[PDB]
Symmetry: D2
Subunit: 220 residues, 4 copies
């Protein structure tokens, strides 16, 4: 698995609240030098990301990181991001809604954002480490099926901000089996080495969210 | 030094975890009425069931990252107020402030001010990030911008940023910057009575607490 | 009915695109002199009405806005102090038979205004002219299903016209005693007013209220 | 004097009735392609089905009244563009223009501009109202506000205001004020091929029509 090949799986990411336009400009330069698939930035940073290169593939987050926004608000955010040049959107579910068993609500929340972006690649962050710690494997699968039923293109493990943690190979395996190659699976959160990255791919991930991409690639 | 009832009267009793359910919020409301606190603070989608649960309600906007365009923060804040929130605690774009874009921070806060009508508007400045990454003057500038944009409070912290939560130095700087014309809400990591009293003595006029019972027993 | 009793049914209304803050202030002054129930103004004028009981409109007059936008608009008005919101349905949605869509559109606004009085403009003159009585009734029931407090006849801007006695009578028969019924559009005389109240209206939307009251 | 295909290329083929259905919109799109128009113009909730109809889509914002706070207009514009609209035709608050609050009109336009990114933004000044209720200089000031706020076009009318729609005089004034830096769209009550060509001769670079076929047949 080559350095260029692993890099083609990667969304090179900066989501810190303190991030400046200059930070986002350096992120895009580093992404181009590394040969990654996209940059992932916070919604108001999309103009800066688009302006920092030619033909930059930009993903933005929506309803992030808490998931605790009403659906209209997540949709509005996603639509402004697409209007500013975002090709993809990584939204967060209402994690508390999943845990209460309101799967209809989770599915409708994702369908609202789906209807607003239209053209864009939509990834749904299920916060798998939170679902697996506070409920069970079954709950994770149900959330994945809601994402599929609502028209999502990816299910995605983690925000990288929840204290329960990030991607596990078990979560990815569970998520990959549930969507069965019909949707992509993005592993994210705490992927810090080459070995972490390869193990997520081996478990079924078809995309990786990384902030320390160079160090991951250097490990090869 | 204040009694239990007096300390409680300073408090916004808070649950903002991503995993919070309606049942968690209903238990939070019941516990706030027992403790005699000033308000509950809940996430925007939980406002209707907090309000209906029979307590003054605050909500958050652009929370916790602050990385949302103004129009998204304003839309969120309008919905929460229309659903019955009495107060909104919004987060600034911390990066905008670090880059020196103080007119943009102010316009961001003005958009929210215009959406909430007469509701109490608190601006979370993420003081521990501003003091870690810039300097005292930058914290003062952000506060003044909040007052210029029509805020009613300046507020230290989200409780979610790794730079930490409320500090005495941050609270005192903020209280001087607003000169008693706005409130100062100290929040994030306030776990004991001594923490609480240290912030009120530094000039806080409201406290954001998640573990209020343990502070009150104090 | 006395002058005072008839006024008590009225939402005293200015919705013209050219309306200024000064026009809105004269409308409120006139409202309070006439003893009306409420003033009805356009969403950006709500702050000036409140600072001078206020109803505002939402998704008005076309009804052609996505649900989230109507809900955003309604919430902003309530936040600036509107006690009531009068929204417009996607009339074309109702005519295509998409009553689930119309209901969902109304429930979105319902969930965004909290405790506000929510009135749903069904554009009854268009529904009767382009569909049928049964469609008008189905739209009213969707409004009830979605949690609305009132059904209302007309924007006063649709070419098909305004309130008719039959539309109001149908709407009152269908949801009367459970939802209020507001007759609006083309109510120009005392006799028009009284004919809508007799048909089952419990609120009236008027622009020329003084003239209507004078005819008693 | 333009050929049929040339006149058609100036046209936004439009359906904005409250009663319009998805089926009405799909017929509109089919007719648009047949006629060779520049674009179809539809109401915001109709954009996704107009885009999916698979042959350029414009939508409107804060239409037709202009009486919506800026944030609502901007929200509405964003959604339409995210659903594939290439252009947005917004409506100013006409009463704000009349009250002399041109800074507020400018800010209202700037709000929509920052929501749409790169889309073509047209600003509807409701010229027939500005001329009937104010004066010519007010029309010019509103055009300047639009330019200053980053609009790509100024545009006469909604076609729903009782003071009427496009006039030769309105179009000449607007085209003078923007001086070829913005486009000028003539719209509202353009009933004949003669009406259309008089607007074009007055400086319009785009035409909003509903009865497009009957206009083109007049050539
Ligand atoms: Cl002619």
């Amino acid at each position: 698995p080559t350095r260029a090949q692993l890099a083609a799986f990667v969304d090179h990411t900066l989501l810190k609240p303190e991030a400046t336009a200059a930070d986002v400009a350096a992120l895009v330069t580093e992404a181009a030098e590394l040969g990654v698939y996209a940059v992932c930035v916070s919604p108001p940073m999309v103009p800066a990301a688009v302006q920092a290169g030619a033909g930059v593939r930009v993903a933005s987050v929506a309803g992030f990181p808490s998931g605790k926004h009403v659906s209209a608000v997540k949709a509005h955010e996603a639509a402004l991001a697409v209007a500013s040049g975002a090709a993809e959107i990584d939204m967060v579910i209402d994690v508390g809604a999943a845990l209460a068993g309101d799967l209809d609500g989770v599915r409708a929340d994702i369908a609202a954002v789906r209807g607003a972006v239209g053209g864009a690649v939509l990834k749904v962050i299920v916060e798998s480490s939170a679902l697996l710690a506070l409920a069970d494997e079954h709950t994770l699968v149900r959330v994945c099926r809601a994402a599929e039923d609502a028209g999502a293109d990816f299910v995605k493990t983690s925000t990288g901000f929840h204290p329960s943690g990030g991607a596990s190979v078990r979560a990815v395996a569970l998520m990959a089996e549930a969507v069965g190659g019909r949707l992509g699976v993005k592993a994210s959160g705490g992927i810090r080495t080459a070995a972490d990255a390869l193990a997520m791919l081996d478990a079924g991930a078809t995309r990786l969210g990384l902030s320390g991409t160079r160090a991951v690639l250097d490990g090869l």
